[PDB]
Design a protein around this ligand. Structure first.
Ligand SMILES: NC(=O)c1ccc[n+]([C@@H]2O[C@H](COP(=O)([O-])OP(=O)(O)OC[C@H]3O[C@@H](n4cnc5c(N)ncnc54)[C@H](O)[C@@H]3O)[C@@H](O)[C@H]2O)c1
Ligand SMILES: NC(=O)c1ccc[n+]([C@@H]2O[C@H](COP(=O)([O-])OP(=O)(O)OC[C@H]3O[C@@H](n4cnc5c(N)ncnc54)[C@H](O)[C@@H]3O)[C@@H](O)[C@H]2O)c1
Ligand SMILES: NC(=O)c1ccc[n+]([C@@H]2O[C@H](COP(=O)([O-])OP(=O)(O)OC[C@H]3O[C@@H](n4cnc5c(N)ncnc54)[C@H](O)[C@@H]3O)[C@@H](O)[C@H]2O)c1
Ligand SMILES: NC(=O)c1ccc[n+]([C@@H]2O[C@H](COP(=O)([O-])OP(=O)(O)OC[C@H]3O[C@@H](n4cnc5c(N)ncnc54)[C@H](O)[C@@H]3O)[C@@H](O)[C@H]2O)c1
Lengths: 332, 332, 332, 332
């Protein structure tokens, strides 16, 4: 299963890192017109958040060699011009942030990609969250898909379990969210979203979250019943969901823990984790899960009204999910 | 007004700063055995968060002189030993953190203080939120009172306006909270609350909030119906309350804004503010309000289930309320 | 004295703010094609580092009105097309960062600007530091000038005084420098300067400084005798120079203090300041000086070998110098 | 070689971590009266800077079990009372910060420790830097020794090499230094050093460095010829030395690189490293070296005047050096 990456950014590079833990999946090609070959090596090798790459790297014969595997590197702006088929790239991760519609992402099909995975929500491409709705993937009616957002991959598995066991009548969520590449170091222009221009390191910044719309798609039963927002805050990675909902079936906090824990050991294993330790955000740097339920941080007001808390490494967990989605799609 | 301050910490220094903008009140004495006179002047003239003092400062003949007013300074460990009476301190602000029950706070009365205001919640002393339960002050029964906490002073005025009009059935809140002096620069010991020992600048840290208990005392109609939690995040000041409640009477967000905006203009003026701009947390550094409702940031899921957002300068807003309370306590 | 601003960025906006403390200077026009009129008001009104604007602002009849003064606003990309003469703009501050050569900056002369000030070093335009070489400004031969860089405006006045009184045989400097708009929030592409792409908030980052080349231009006698570098560190503003030099004339630290202090009270007044207080970087947020000598932080190894320390608000001090340079140029 | 640790702080815990990579050394006992047994496990297991511990941990029968090795845990305030001999602890790392003199540290000898290593400079105990002066350790008349400071372990090996090959006539250094446990989250009291009280995350803070005095002890030939200072800046770990010196023997930058590189591969291997990559501070999180020379960051003004740059993980490198010093002392 041969993979191409468009945009060698935070997500692109960490998809690359994650792919090395999946023996079936092999990245064969990467495209980024703002990062030439030798610079790709540097950016892959040193990471401020996740530390130095532990394997080997080399630039050789115009190719990026990672753990002995040669990777083709391109510097093209128009994704329709990337020669994926020539490089062997069946599946393409679209992770630039700027080709999120089906029309735009479909450009990778012109270069001979079979399937495109948009590493972000889409206005029209079908969205998926591993552990929640991947069964609805139709191989041969869908070609361009989305892996939703990081917040959607945290919220959806938790929401599924709470809804399946107890029924969410209504709910609202907040993510306390790490700053990202779209934000600014000091107050600068962000013409569409004014607050997102304000210095990331100085500010708690209210913002939209992709999970607000996406959660209703990935779990149809919850559309109109569950939405939310984000505050961008000054940590470079790791985020946390704060889900407040009224329940249909009255319950206790102990039973909530029991079902979530059991899901973490069985059907959602690898996606949903469970902890009872006294954790903070830096404890999830380079965690591979989509959602880590924090038992101690939750609050139960009464039998039908609760606040649940779940951590996610917004970079690393999501990147591992992109790879799981590829492997799941390839087994058809 | 005449006021004495015990403890020249964050709240003590900024109550002193706020007192100079209130012409009713004048601080005449300060006690702290861990800050000598020249160091008190330094600590008062320079502030990393609120900037340099804009008046004049001087040390002269053993007094600290701020805009020409001499202030006597003591270095006493036992509050019973502070001679408030021999400097004319009618109202004493207890802002050390270690004299929070009425028995210990009462020690200032034994040194000629007539009324004592604890700048923190108390287990037994009556708590007050300006603009919520301030008239429940009884100038015949209560010689030591508490001004609750910053987060309480932000949540209580927003809760009152929403409850009085739309009756809050159930509600849960989060405050995204600036780190404080009780936190650590790097991972260090915090034997009672493990999460609070972890590096403040590196971490989003779940924690308890003083408003969880206090809000039920300052608004008894809301006791068993409203609680919440905090997340400590890496900003040095300014916090934001995230309140999600189900309502009794259905409404629209534009009607939510209507009642908040004109409660802002009438009975809660100076305490609850209202804005429609695209603000971020540093826009409230040195703001004087208890609670600034963020119109654009709120979310309405359905006519009876809503998420409200309100900012507060946890240092400066609370300090102006301590002084506003001294005036309200006086004046009878 | 009527001023136009090209690029409403950190420096452009703070030049605007600073101009309001100079009653002779009036900004009549601003050009930025990435910030429309209503957004200009927002970005001017709120500042994460320098706090809210204290005067009045309004958008009216397609103009930005600041303290009652209407300002014409343009959204043109090619500076040759900005109609400065129509707006009354005699002097134009070129503060976009992309028109730093004489040829490019000269475009504002079409559009009938009389003089252009490049808010950054130039490869060929003559550079100036107020208090150091402004006498060399020839108003009949130089229509495009540069105000050097922030670090050059800190280092040059100090260096002048030390060189004039003691002789710098050789010297090297470091600036511990706030991060700027050119840096990234998380590790991203910075193709020419790889270290500058690494997350600004996580990293101490070695970098070039404009003072390395510029100081030899503004003080010819020191060319080849004085250079240096920078470390970008995680504060949003305020920087500090660490100047290490061997001296020709042997001296003592007390005499160094005396000459610097005297210069701060006389010939370099307003540009070079002198303090003996126990200051830190946040104490200079919104300071107007080019260079604040820190007496206590210095070290004298022996009579001819010293380390001097000088603070600067890299945003605000430099912005005030741009305005002083305009006023100085206008008085011809 | 059996080791006891007094004070389970940053250095104590990371000495513990480092000891696990040294097969000869086994920590058998730990004392800290402010961190009980179960809390020790928590604090060891999660670390905001260095990530989760990768081995196993357990509390059993009143002992801390790390990778199957049981560790005796004590909660005693007076080091004279710790029964090291009972636990088998030959060598004791004194890492509390408060028993740094020979008289005080000698208290561990009463409990049956053979040797004490003070994890900090001492006014009178002999100081050592591995790779520089460990030959001067006399296992005949030296039971209490010091491993100097982190900055001294960075500076001394570099200085040795430059002095040995070229001669340092005179020099001054700066360390741009991570904030530490002694600093404050927000502006608080620090009565002896007023700047160290100012909020660590908001400020670049001038400070003293232990290397200023210590370097003259560990390299007698350089006493009076080399001193310096620090700026504390907002990163949680990793620091960097900026060494400016005049040389006796004229040289070129290429030859400086060649000697440092050669030293890094031979006599100073493991202590002094050499890189030519475009590194930043986060690239050295959990690096084990005392000093990593940054070839690209250096500047040569002229053949006898240079600025050299060397990184160090102030926590982890120093901790590994404490263990190397133990193993070196145990051989004898
Ligand atoms: N990092 C997160 O927290 C996170 C989590 C979930 C989803 N996402 C989503 O993943 C996507 C990538 O985000 P990121 O954080 O990696 O941003 P990033 O800035 O790190 O990566 C974007 C990369 O794409 C490249 N690029 C831009 N335009 C291009 C073009 N036309 N052709 C080829 N390459 C191009 C850039 O050089 C850059 O390297 C975004 O849509 C984002 O919303 C991010
Ligand atoms: N800081 C906030 O954001 C905030 C908000 C609301 C309420 N409060 C409450 O206000 C109180 C003070 O908080 P702060 O932030 O000013 O803390 P702080 O630690 O900055 O101030 C405490 C001061 O008290 C002094 N002190 C300690 N023991 C003393 C004693 N025995 N006698 C006299 N002085 C003594 C200390 O030296 C220090 O200067 C706490 O109870 C806190 O919970 C704080
Ligand atoms: N901020 C500092 O610390 C500092 C100090 C000294 C010098 N400078 C210099 O001042 C200049 C501006 O720096 P800044 O910090 O304000 O950066 P910035 O990114 O905040 O400002 C640049 C502004 O110019 C605008 N712009 C870009 N291209 C344009 C064009 N063709 N026409 C009109 N506007 C355009 C952008 O929209 C932006 O608002 C730079 O050259 C910088 O080197 C900055
Ligand atoms: N972190 C660094 O950058 C660094 C580098 C080199 C050296 N050091 C030095 O190492 C020493 C320890 O530093 P740290 O970073 O571990 O500080 P820390 O504050 O993290 O740890 C100190 C520990 O000692 C304990 N302690 C206090 N009093 C005690 C007593 N009477 N008995 C037993 N234990 C007691 C504390 O509870 C704490 O756990 C300091 O002297 C410091 O100067 C630190």
């Amino acid at each position: 299963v041969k993979v191409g990456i468009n945009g060698f950014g935070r997500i692109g590079r960490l998809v690359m890192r994650a792919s090395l833990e999946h023996p079936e999946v092999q990245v064969v090609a990467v495209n980024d017109p703002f990062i030439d070959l030798e610079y790709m090596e540097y950016m892959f090798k040193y990471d401020s958040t996740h530390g130095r790459f532990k394997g080997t790297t080399e630039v050789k014969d115009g190719k990026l060699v990672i753990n002995g595997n040669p990777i083709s590197v391109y510097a093209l702006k128009d994704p329709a011009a990337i020669p994926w088929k020539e490089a062997g790239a069946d599946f393409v991760v679209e992770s630039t942030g700027v080709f999120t519609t089906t029309e735009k992402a479909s450009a990778h099909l012109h270069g001979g990609a079979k399937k495109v995975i948009i590493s972000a929500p889409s206005a029209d491409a079908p969205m998926f969250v591993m552990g929640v709705n991947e069964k609805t993937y139709d191989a041969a009616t869908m070609n361009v898909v989305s892996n939703a957002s990081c917040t959607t991959n945290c919220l959806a598995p938790l929401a599924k379990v709470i809804n399946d066991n107890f029924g969410i009548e209504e709910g609202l969520m907040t993510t306390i969210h790490a700053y990202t590449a779209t934000q600014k170091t000091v107050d600068g222009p962000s013409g569409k979203k004014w607050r997102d221009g304000r210095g990331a390191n100085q500010n708690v910044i209210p913002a939209t979250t992709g999970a607000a719309k996406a959660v209703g798609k990935v779990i149809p039963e919850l559309n109109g019943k569950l939405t939310g927002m984000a505050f961008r805050v000054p940590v470079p990675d790791v985020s946390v969901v704060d889900l407040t909902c009224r329940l249909k079936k009255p319950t206790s906090y102990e039973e909530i823990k029991k079902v979530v824990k059991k899901a973490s050991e069985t059907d959602l294993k690898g996606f949903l984790a469970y902890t009872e330790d006294q954790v903070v955000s830096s404890d999830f740097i380079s965690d591979t899960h989509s959602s880590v339920f924090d038992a101690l941080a939750g609050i139960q007001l009464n039998p039908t009204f609760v606040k649940l808390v779940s951590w996610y490494d917004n970079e690393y967990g999501y990147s591992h999910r992109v790879v799981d989605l590829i492997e799941y799609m390839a087994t058809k």
